[PDB]
């Protein structure tokens, strides 16, 4: 017997993201280009606003 436990699983896909590096070299924010029209617009301009 092994008591109780749980875990989550997801499967990866080939995507192109846009990453924001903090002043301390940390990936604080990311944008996925194929999620929705707004995100793809953000990717095309190469800006988060």
């Amino acid at each position: 017997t092994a008591g109780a436990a749980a875990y989550y699983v997801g499967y990866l896909q080939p995507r192109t993201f846009l990453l924001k590096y903090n002043e301390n070299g940390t990936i604080t924010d990311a944008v996925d280009c194929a999620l929705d029209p707004l995100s793809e617009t953000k990717c095309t301009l190469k800006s988060f606003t």
Partner: protein, 49 residues
């Protein structure tokens, strides 16, 4: 010495919305570069995990 005790009755798995998870680092340092497009295998945001 393994012993056979496993049970395999069906169970309806649960789902959830994986959001902003599954982004990892590059090899080198990018400093304060607000953007850097990168194409790779990731976990799309707001997916059924």
């Amino acid at each position: 010495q393994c012993v056979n005790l496993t049970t395999r009755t069906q169970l309806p798995p649960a789902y959830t919305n994986s959001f902003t998870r599954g982004v990892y680092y590059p090899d080198k340092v990018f400093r304060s570069s607000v953007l850097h497009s990168t194409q790779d295998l990731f976990l799309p945001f707001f997916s059924n995990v």
